[PDB]
C-alpha cells in the first residue's frame, strides 16, 4: 500500500474526462456484461498470428460460438498455443472479426496455463480500500481465485464489480456516482506491482476499453493482496 495523500498526487484521469457512452460501457463491461471463464481448454487455432481463436467456445449463446483472444505477439501466443489453458476475461462483439461470421466475440489476454496451476485451496485475495483516505472494511470473499499464477485481469474484473455494487463507480454523477477518480494496485511481494488508473481507460467502446488486458499479465496469487484508493475530488 501507500499514503492516500501521495497516491492522491499522481495524475489519474478524471470521470470528467470521459467522452460519450464510454462510462456506461465500463459499467457495462464490469457490472452487467458476461465474461469468459472455462478451464482446461486447448487450441492452436488462430485468425492473424497475434491471436488464438477458440473454435466453438460458446455453447447456448444467442449470437456467438467463438471467442478470439488477442495477444501482443506471436511470442505470447507460442506460450499458450496448442497447450492446456484457462481463460477468465471480459469479451465483446461490436467490430470483432475472425470467428464464424457475425457469430464471434473478442477478448484480450486473460489466459493462464492449466497444468499445475490449481491451488490446494481457494485463495481469497485481501483488498484494502480507501474512500477519501478513510479506510473501509471490504470482505475477504470479494476477490477469490483458484489459480496460482492468476492473471491480473481475473482479479480486476472482480474488484471492479465490487466498486460498482458498493460505490456506483461507473454510474453517472446524476445516478449518484460520487467517486470522480480511483486507482487500483495489485500487490505482489516478489514481483513489480500492477497499477491501473480507474478512469484512465482509452476509447469509447469495448474494443479499446479492454486493451488494458492485451499484454495478458499474470502474477503469483499467494502472499499477495489488493489496494484501492478512490477520490471524490
Amino acid at each position: 500500500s501507500e499514503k492516500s495523500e501521495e497516491i492522491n498526487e499522481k495524475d489519474l484521469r478524471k470521470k470528467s474526462e470521459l467522452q460519450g457512452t464510454a462510462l456506461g460501457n465500463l459499467k457495462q463491461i464490469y457490472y452487467y456484461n458476461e465474461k469468459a471463464k472455462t478451464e482446461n481448454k486447448e487450441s492452436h487455432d488462430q485468425f492473424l498470428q497475434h491471436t488464438i481463436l477458440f473454435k466453438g467456445f460458446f455453447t447456448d449463446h444467442s449470437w456467438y460460438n467463438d471467442l478470439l483472444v488477442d495477444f501482443d505477439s506471436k511470442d505470447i501466443v507460442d506460450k499458450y498455443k496448442g497447450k492446456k489453458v484457462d481463460l477468465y476475461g471480459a469479451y465483446y462483439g461490436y467490430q470483432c472479426a475472425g470467428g464464424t461470421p457475425n457469430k464471434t466475440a473478442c477478448m484480450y489476454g486473460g489466459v493462464t496455463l492449466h497444468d499445475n496451476n490449481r491451488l490446494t485451496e481457494e485463495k481469497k485475495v485481501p483488498i484494502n480500500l480507501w474512500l477519501d483516505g478513510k479506510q473501509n472494511t471490504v470482505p475477504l470473499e470479494t476477490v477469490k481465485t483458484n489459480k496460482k499464477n492468476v492473471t491480473v485481469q481475473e482479479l480486476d474484473l472482480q474488484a471492479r464489480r465490487y466498486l460498482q455494487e458498493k460505490y456506483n463507480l461507473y454510474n453517472s454523477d446524476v445516478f449518484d456516482g460520487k467517486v470522480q477518480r480511483g486507482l487500483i494496485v495489485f500487490h505482489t511481494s516478489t514481483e513489480p506491482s500492477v497499477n491501473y488508473d480507474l478512469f484512465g481507460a482509452q476509447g469509447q467502446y469495448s474494443n479499446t476499453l479492454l486493451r488494458i488486458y492485451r499484454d495478458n499479465k499474470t502474477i503469483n496469487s499467494e502472499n499477495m493482496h489488493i489496494a484501492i484508493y478512490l477520490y471524490t475530488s
Partner: protein
C-alpha cells in the same frame, strides 16, 4: 495511365495475412493487422486522406476463410516455391563522408515469407532499418524492400542477407564503395 490496387493476402500455415493499397507500384498504405491501424507509406499521405483499418481486418477474415475452402477443393495441393532476386542498390551516387542509404530490393518471389538481415563487416545492424510489406506484381509473385541508412567510407563493407525457401543457401549481396 494510372492503376490503383487493393491487393491483399492470407497464407497458411503461417496464418499471416496482409492488406495494402497500391498506386502504380508504390505502396500508398497498408493496415497493421496487429495494431489495427492504417499505416501511410509517407507520413504526408495521412494529413490528407484516411482509412478505417477495421475494414481490412474483416476482409482478411474472409480471405482466411476462402483459403481453407480452396485448399481443400484443390485437394491440398501446395504452393511451389519461387526463389527471389535480390539487388542491393543505393539512394544516390555515394559520396564519401556524404550520407546515403543502402537498398535491398527483394523481387520476383513467392510465397510471401522472406528473411532479410543487414551485415556491416560481417556483423548485424539496427541503424534505422525499416522495410516494406509485400508489394504486388503483374505475375502475382511479390516484390519487397529493405533500407539501411549509412555514412559512406572505405573503412566499411556492407551486405544484404536474404533467406527464402526457394534458395538452397542464404543469399548474400555485398556492396562496397569503389575508388
Amino acid at each position: 495511365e494510372h492503376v490503383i490496387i487493393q491487393a491483399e493476402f492470407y497464407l497458411n500455415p503461417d496464418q499471416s495475412g496482409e492488406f495494402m493499397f497500391d498506386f502504380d507500384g508504390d505502396e500508398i498504405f497498408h493496415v497493421d493487422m496487429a495494431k489495427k491501424e492504417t499505416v501511410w507509406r509517407l507520413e504526408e499521405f495521412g494529413r490528407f486522406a484516411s482509412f478505417e483499418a477495421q475494414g481490412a481486418l474483416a476482409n482478411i477474415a474472409v480471405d482466411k476463410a476462402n483459403l481453407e475452402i480452396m485448399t481443400k477443393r484443390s485437394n491440398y495441393t501446395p504452393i511451389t516455391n519461387v526463389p527471389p532476386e535480390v539487388t542491393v542498390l543505393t539512394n544516390s551516387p555515394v559520396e564519401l563522408r556524404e550520407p546515403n542509404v543502402l537498398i535491398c530490393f527483394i523481387d520476383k518471389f513467392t510465397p510471401p515469407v522472406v528473411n532479410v538481415t543487414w551485415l556491416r563487416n560481417g556483423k548485424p545492424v539496427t541503424t534505422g532499418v525499416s522495410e516494406t510489406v509485400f508489394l504486388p506484381r503483374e505475375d502475382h509473385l511479390f516484390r519487397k524492400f529493405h533500407y539501411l541508412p549509412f555514412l559512406p567510407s572505405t573503412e566499411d563493407v556492407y551486405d544484404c542477407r536474404v533467406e527464402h525457401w526457394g534458395l538452397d543457401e542464404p543469399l548474400l549481396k555485398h556492396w562496397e564503395f569503389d575508388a
